[PDB]
Amino acid sequence: LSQDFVEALKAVVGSPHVSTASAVREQHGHDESMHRCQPPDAVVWPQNVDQVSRVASLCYNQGVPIIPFGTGTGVEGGVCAVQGGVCINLTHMDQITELNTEDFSVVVEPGVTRKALNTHLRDSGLWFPVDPGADASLCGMAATGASGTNAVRYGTMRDNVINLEVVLPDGRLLHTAGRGRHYRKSAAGYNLTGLFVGSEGTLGIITSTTLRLHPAPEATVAATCAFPSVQAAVDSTVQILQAAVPVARIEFLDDVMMDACNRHSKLNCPVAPTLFLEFHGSQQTLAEQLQRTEAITQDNGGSHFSWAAEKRNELWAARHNAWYAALALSPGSKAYSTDVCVPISRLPEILVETKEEIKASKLTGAIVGHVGDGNFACILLVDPDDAEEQRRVKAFAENLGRRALALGGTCTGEHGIGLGKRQLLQEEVGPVGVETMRQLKNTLDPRGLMNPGKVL
C-alpha cells in the first residue's frame, strides 16, 4: 500500500485516524470466530459521513478493498481482510439522533450499541428489543441481519430496521427509504432497505440505521425449566409455539451448555436440557400465559418453573455470555458455530440428531438456541493449533448445515455467511439464486472492492 495513498487517507480523516501499524491492523483482522486473522493494510476511523464517502471513493477508484468494521463481534470472518485493503472502523460516529418517541423510532450511528441506546431510552417507556449477546454496533447488527432472544416476540433486525443511510462503494450516499423518512409500511418502489439488511458490508457501508422502538412491557416474569431430555425440551418448545403462547423469550440450552454457563456465570441451575423463558404482559395476561405454558412443559416432564430485577438480569446475562462460557470449557480455544434455522416442526429431529452426532464424535460441543424461531447454534471449541481437529469441526458444521437444507431450512438464521458458509449458500438458493445475488452485488460494487471474498 503506497505512501501517497496513506497520505491521501490522512488528508480525509486526519493523521490520528489512520494507522498502518501491525498491531492495530492485527486487532482489526479477525472477529470472535476461529477464522484466521488476516490483517488489513490500514485501519481508518472516519469522523462523519462525508469522510466515509471520501475514504470509500479514494479506495474504490484506486482498486483498494474496503472492509467495514463495527465492533468486531461477528462470528463468520466478515471483517477478515482476505485481499488486504483498508478497514473502515465506523465506531467514532456514535450519536443518537431523531428520537421520535411518539412515532416509536430513532436514528443511530455505527458507534451506538444496544446498551447505549437503551440507556438513552430509560424513563421514555420505550426500548429496542433485538439483543445479540454481544454489545454490538447496531449498524453492524443491521449489516449482519442479527436477531436475539427477544426476536420470537419482537422481531429480528429485518423486522425492526425502517431505513438505512448507506455509503455505496464508490462514495455515493443512499437513504434506502428516502432521507429522513420513517413509517410503518410502504409499497413505494422496490424495498431497498431489506436488500442492505444482512448484506454484511458487501454492498456498501451503513452509516446510520433508523430503528423501530417498542413499548416496555407492563410486567415481566422470567423462569427456567429443566427437562429429562433434549427431545422433551424441544417438543415443549414446538408445542408452546403451536399453541400460540406469545412468549417474549424462549431459549434452549443443552446440559453441556447449562453446565458451562453455571461455571462461567455462577448460576446454579440443574445440569439438564433447559428452557430459559420470559413472559410479558399485564397481571391477567401473565397468569394466563403461565398456566398454558406450564401445562405444556409439565406434559413433557419439565420441572416446576424456577422463577427469577437483579435475578432476571443475571439469568439473561449468563445466556448472553454463553459463547464465552463455551470457550471457557477449553481455555485458549476459539470456536466455530453453526446457526441453522428449520421449519419448527422439524426442530425436534435436527436438535436430537445434532446432540446424538456430537456424542458420537470426539468433538466438544455446546448447544444453545433461539428455538422459538426454529434456530439453534452448535458452538464447537477448537485448539487453534490442532489442524486435524479443525477439519473435523467444519466437517461437522457443513454436515449439520446440509441436514438443515435437506429439511427445507436455511444454513444461517442470524449470524450470516461471511467466509464460512459460502458453499452452503450456493446449495441453499441454487444457480439462479446465486447469479441473481451476484448481479445485485455487481451493480452496487462493479469493481468487487466492497469486502471481497465474503458471502458470494
Applying CB under 6 A, which residues contact ligand FAD? 31-32, 67-75, 78-79, 90, 110, 132-134, 136-137, 139-141, 143-144, 146-148, 200-201, 205-206, 323-324, 414-415, 451, 454
Q: How far is the CB of 284 from ligand FAD (least distance, A)?
A: 31
Per 3-state DSSP, the chain is made up of helix, strand and coil in percentages (nearest 5) of 40, 20, 40
Q: Which amino acid belongs to residue 326?
A: A
Q: Could you give the C-alpha distances from 389 to 12, 36, 364, in angstroms and in order? A: 45, 15, 10
Q: Would you state the cell numbers that stand for residue 287, as one nine-digit string?
A: 397468569
- C-beta closer to ligand FAD: residue 49 or 407: 49
Q: How far is the CB of 51 from ligand FAD (least distance, A)?
A: 14
- C-beta closer to ligand FAD: residue 140 or 281: 140
Q: How far is the CB of 22 from ligand FAD (least distance, A)?
A: 20
- C-beta closer to ligand FAD: residue 86 or 136: 136
* Angle formed by the axes of helices 230-242 and 283-299, nearest 10°: 140
Q: How far apart are CA 98 and CA 108, in angstroms?
A: 8
Q: How far is the CB of 152 from ligand FAD (least distance, A)?
A: 12
Q: How far is the CB of 250 from ligand FAD (least distance, A)?
A: 13
Q: How far is the CB of 130 from ligand FAD (least distance, A)?
A: 8
Q: How far is the CB of 418 from ligand FAD (least distance, A)?
A: 6
- C-beta closer to ligand FAD: residue 254 or 414: 414
Q: How far is the CB of 137 from ligand FAD (least distance, A)?
A: 4
* H helices, E strands: number in the chain: 16, 18
Q: How far is the CB of 73 from ligand FAD (least distance, A)?
A: 3
Which helix (H) or strand (E) segment holds residue 145: the answer is none
Which helix (H) or strand (E) segment holds residue 11: the answer is helix 3-13
Q: How far is the CB of 367 from ligand FAD (least distance, A)?
A: 14
**Separation of CA 55 from chain center:** 27
Give the number of residues written for the chain: 456
- C-beta closer to ligand FAD: residue 212 or 415: 415
Q: Which amino acid belongs to residue 389?
A: E
DSSP designation for 206:
E
- C-beta closer to ligand FAD: residue 24 or 286: 24
Which helix (H) or strand (E) segment holds residue 100: the answer is strand 96-100
264 neighbors 214 (Cβ within 8 angstroms): no
Q: Which amino acid belongs to residue 301?
A: G
Q: Would you state the cell numbers that stand for residue 282, as one nine-digit string?
A: 399485564
How wide is the angle at C-alpha 370 spanned by C-alphas 366 and 373, nearest 5°?
A: 140
Q: How far apart are CA 142 and CA 379, in angstroms?
A: 23
- C-beta closer to ligand FAD: residue 286 or 437: 437
- C-beta closer to ligand FAD: residue 161 or 358: 161
Q: Which amino acid belongs to residue 193?
A: T
- C-beta closer to ligand FAD: residue 302 or 420: 420
- C-beta closer to ligand FAD: residue 18 or 93: 93
Question: b or e along 188-203 (b: 16 or more beta carbons within 10 Å of the residue's beta carbon)?
Answer: eeeeebebbbbbbbbb
* DSSP reduced 3-state for 290: helix
Nearest residue to 264 (alpha-carbon basis) of 325, 312, 315 = 325
